[PDB]
Design a protein around this ligand. Structure first.
Ligand SMILES: *[C@@H]1O[C@H](CO)[C@@H](O)[C@H](O)[C@H]1NC(C)=O
Ligand SMILES: *[C@@H]1O[C@H](CO)[C@@H](O)[C@H](O)[C@H]1NC(C)=O
Ligand SMILES: *[C@@H]1O[C@H](CO)[C@@H](O)[C@H](O)[C@H]1NC(C)=O
Ligand SMILES: *[C@@H]1O[C@H](CO)[C@@H](O)[C@H](O)[C@H]1NC(C)=O
Ligand SMILES: *[P@](=O)(OCC)N(C)C
Ligand SMILES: *[P@](=O)(OCC)N(C)C
Lengths: 532, 532
């Protein structure tokens, strides 16, 4: 039967799922690791012991233990990102959508969810791989990985809680895909990893980490890159947060062994309840437990790896959304609310600047403020609002990515860059938030093709164009069809810095994505803070 | 006779001069001080001893000893600013144009020439007061003052060369006008001083200096303000330059008395020949011998005087030209030449940035470069040229003036601000230099009314409008006619920061003259240099 697949770990039985008047196969909740529970909490993942009998792969697995957004109870705009299955520490599972009839050896895409390394689920409605797998004839995998303290508590030098284990979870899923996807009709040597936000940064981190490079062919990064200021901490800072966590739970702090032991007796929600108290600054766009630059997973600093070409050399496709900042300003910054226009006073602008660049001294904040203020009109609340939006997105997403782009391209084999600036017509978040980060995912996963979801015709066209770009790139390393028309997505190069925008209008090519602001963020402001 | 005036210093006989098909009286080369020659070189001026008989005031006096521009021999664009009379240390004279028949008690305007405190002449063709005096029925005075080492060699604590004596020359001329202008039909209590460039800065310095305030009613400043970075040095820096000068002339440097004595035995041209070797930095827009903040003429620093309201409170009218920077880039910066378009490479841009901000460290130069570079297009030689033009003008003229404007207005009785951006149709300097500083003077002195000078009709209109603004302001403290139409030059205020532009188009009102760049120059860059 087409729903039964013998893998090196044992047999699995999937389920036929309907999709757009046809059907395909889905194998849901396949374990790729031992449950990281009990004395294995905080440990590196172990491979799943093989099983006899048939593993029932017909339903979604649990989601990992995580903070749950209750800012807007009942609001679909926020609820659509919360876990939709029971949370559990037993959560290391993957899901596979397979064209029907089963391919013999086709392109494979593996999805890595975002969520600030503190949240995320493989089972969200908007991550349903059936439309992509069916439309583009790819084998679609989504993995899972521990988040929060469970994934990234870092007590460096200890083997019980070394850090980065959520990243090692991702790699174990990629190892399982490498070893077994051939039995689902996938080509293990044509695997594209792709992810958004912290998943985009995760993708970039596997490009860098030597122990991950050989497990995939090429990479797509959306709204995230490994060098983002929120995506890693030093070994000393990871240590400090781990101790501060045990201090919040009245733990014995006399040794790593005492500390880790206390944290493993706590119920998961006790860890989640205090996770946010360990941050060093009053800040936005910063998360407690994130990857650590440990000298093992990352051999040296990200910047010297980027400078020296110490990373996988392949093709990449990556890009950003227009309004990366609005979500985190909405949730953490004074003056912004969901039900108003969020016109920002000059005082609230300055508070926002302080929260957005928490490591800066006063001279640095003056520089950021000068850079983003229209001094002909400094009390325009629209401009103050949009100015803060740009500050948060430039600093945390766009300019880190553009730095990564420019360093990668010197050594890589092909870079394609996009700027997604279409705002979906059925968006429930207020207009002032614009093209909100994560809201290209639904176009990538093909949701506008489902008519009951009330997208425009042009949005359906845009989704089909994006899905065909991502899948053609996965298959060939180039998002363009060889011998079709449609104006070509140009290669990003060191001299042109060409990119396209993605929206419902006929595509245009531009150059030097936000170069003016990113010279400020990537070159000037670091030198200023270094001097003061 | 109308050409004979008995003054408190003795009788003077002037000359009838023709002007635009009529005539007026001119009294040229009236001495207001003893010749500052011999052992009086570098000394404070002494008042002119009265004379018997009639002083022949029918011809222009000598000009003061000064550096003479030979960069473009024969070129009228430069030659029109050089001395047109014999140079001599015997040069403290003034000139008066008087309407005919002689007024009984009319508005008085006193002109102070610019020239970087190192040059200038009261007798230039473009300073001919007959058109203004005749057209606006004012009594027009132009004074003179020592420049160069002769005017500003500063050995503080010495009474033989205390500094600022060129400024004291100006004040002695103003004292003479105060005491005697009534006999020429002038109203001594309605005197307006006005000057361009270093003369504008001179005007501002008399506003500040307590010993000058009572000698005039109101003030006009063109393209200069007392706080300009080139317009003053500290007492220690003035001392260092004075010693460096004597060192260039093999002077005994064991004491102030030995040093001053050696400098007084040198012929004037020996001083001029080495004057430029004493500058501390490789720089543009900096001059060797300039006013010194001495604790007497200026009681404390200019900035604390401005902050505390320690200055004359009256009405002022002031403004700038659009392209303040081009002259000094032409003369001192690599890549600029008179006969080409002066498209600037990125290397020459950076050299220019270094010359323009000589006191800055590398972080500061990076800030200036970032601020003025279009990073979408950083190899456009037009933009690099115009960018450097703006750097030089913003830093040296516009943003100092705007700082002065904003500090003065908090305490003054009326501020009018202008932006002169008409380029004269008969300008011989190349197009890339734009609206060059000093080239509003000819409109102020009414030269477009002389038909043989080949101005357009509209330029003649513009000159008449400007002359009527300056003279109405001098008479009343407001450049607008009470009960005429013509859209009104608005008052500059702390909240609007309204100004007008002056050109041949129907005037427009704007707000916040170059506020974005001047927040950089006046607030950010000082705090950055202070921190590094
Ligand atoms: C697989 O598990 C689901 C979970 O309830 C169950 O409903 C389904 O019948 C199972 N299928 C089997 C055991 O074949
Ligand atoms: C990709 O690699 C091949 C061979 O390694 C090379 O011929 C080709 O030019 C590369 N493409 C780019 C864009 O570097
Ligand atoms: C005034 O001086 C000039 C200078 O040469 C002379 O030509 C003129 O005749 C003199 N007028 C007198 C002395 O009345
Ligand atoms: C000028 O001064 C007078 C009285 O000193 C005052 O009534 C008037 O308002 C002042 N004008 C301005 C613009 O300050
Ligand atoms: P991403 O993972 O999405 C926010 C939850 N972010 C850039 C951290
Ligand atoms: P100004 O006096 O004119 C240049 C000779 N300048 C701003 C110093």
């Amino acid at each position: 039967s087409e729903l039964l697949v013998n893998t090196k770990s044992g047999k699995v039985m999937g389920t036929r799922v309907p999709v757009l008047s046809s059907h395909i196969s889905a194998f849901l909740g396949i374990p790729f690791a031992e449950p990281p529970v009990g004395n294995m909490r905080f440990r590196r993942p172990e491979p799943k012991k093989p099983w006899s009998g048939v593993w029932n792969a017909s339903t979604y697995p649990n989601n990992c233990q995580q903070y749950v957004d209750e800012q807007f109870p009942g609001f679909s705009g926020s609820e659509m990102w919360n876990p939709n299955r029971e949370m559990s520490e037993d959560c290391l599972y993957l899901n596979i959508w397979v064209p029907s009839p089963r391919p013999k050896s086709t392109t494979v895409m593996v999805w890595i969810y975002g969520g600030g390394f503190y949240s995320g689920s493989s089972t969200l409605d908007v991550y349903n791989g059936k439309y992509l797998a069916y439309t583009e004839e790819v084998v679609l995998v989504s993995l899972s990985y521990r988040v929060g303290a469970f994934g990234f508590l870092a007590l460096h030098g200890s083997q019980e809680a070394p850090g980065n284990v959520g990243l090692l979870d991702q790699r174990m899923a990629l190892q399982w895909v490498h070893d077994n996807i051939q039995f689902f009709g996938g080509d293990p040597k044509t695997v594209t990893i792709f992810g958004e936000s912290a998943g985009g940064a995760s993708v970039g981190m596997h490009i860098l980490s030597p122990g991950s490079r050989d497990l995939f062919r090429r990479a797509i990064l959306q709204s995230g890159s490994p060098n983002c200021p929120w995506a890693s901490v030093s070994v000393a800072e990871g240590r400090r947060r781990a101790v501060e966590l045990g201090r919040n739970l009245n733990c014995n702090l006399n040794s790593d062994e005492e500390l880790i032991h206390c944290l493993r007796e706590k119920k998961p929600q006790e860890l989640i309840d205090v996770e946010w108290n360990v941050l060093p600054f009053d800040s936005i766009f910063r998360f407690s437990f994130v990857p650590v630059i440990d000298g093992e997973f990352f051999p040296t600093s990200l910047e010297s790896m980027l400078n020296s070409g110490n990373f996988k050399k392949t093709q990449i496709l990556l890009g950003v959304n227009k309004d990366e900042g609005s979500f985190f300003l909405l949730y953490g910054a004074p003056g912004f609310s969901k039900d108003s226009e969020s016109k920002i006073s000059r005082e609230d602008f300055m508070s926002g600047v302080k929260l957005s660049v928490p490591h800066a001294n006063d001279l640095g904040l003056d520089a950021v403020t000068l850079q983003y203020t229209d001094w002909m009109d400094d009390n325009n609340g629209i401009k103050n609002r949009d100015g803060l939006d740009d500050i948060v997105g430039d600093h945390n997403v766009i300019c880190p990515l553009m730095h990564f782009v420019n360093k990668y391209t010197k050594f890589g084999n092909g870079t394609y860059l996009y700027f997604f600036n279409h705002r979906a017509s059925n968006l429930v978040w207020p207009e002032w938030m614009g093209v909100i980060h994560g809201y290209e995912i639904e176009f990538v996963f093909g949701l506008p093709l489902v008519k009951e979801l009330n997208y425009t015709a042009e949005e359906e066209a845009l989704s089909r164009r994006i899905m065909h770009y991502w899948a053609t790139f996965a298959k060939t390393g180039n998002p363009n069809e060889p011998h079709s028309q449609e104006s070509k997505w140009p290669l990003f190069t060191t001299k042109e810095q060409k990119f396209i925008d993605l929206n419902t209008e006929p595509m245009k090519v531009h150059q030097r994505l936000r170069v003016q602001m990113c010279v400020f963020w990537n070159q000037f402001l670091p030198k200023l803070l270094n001097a003061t």
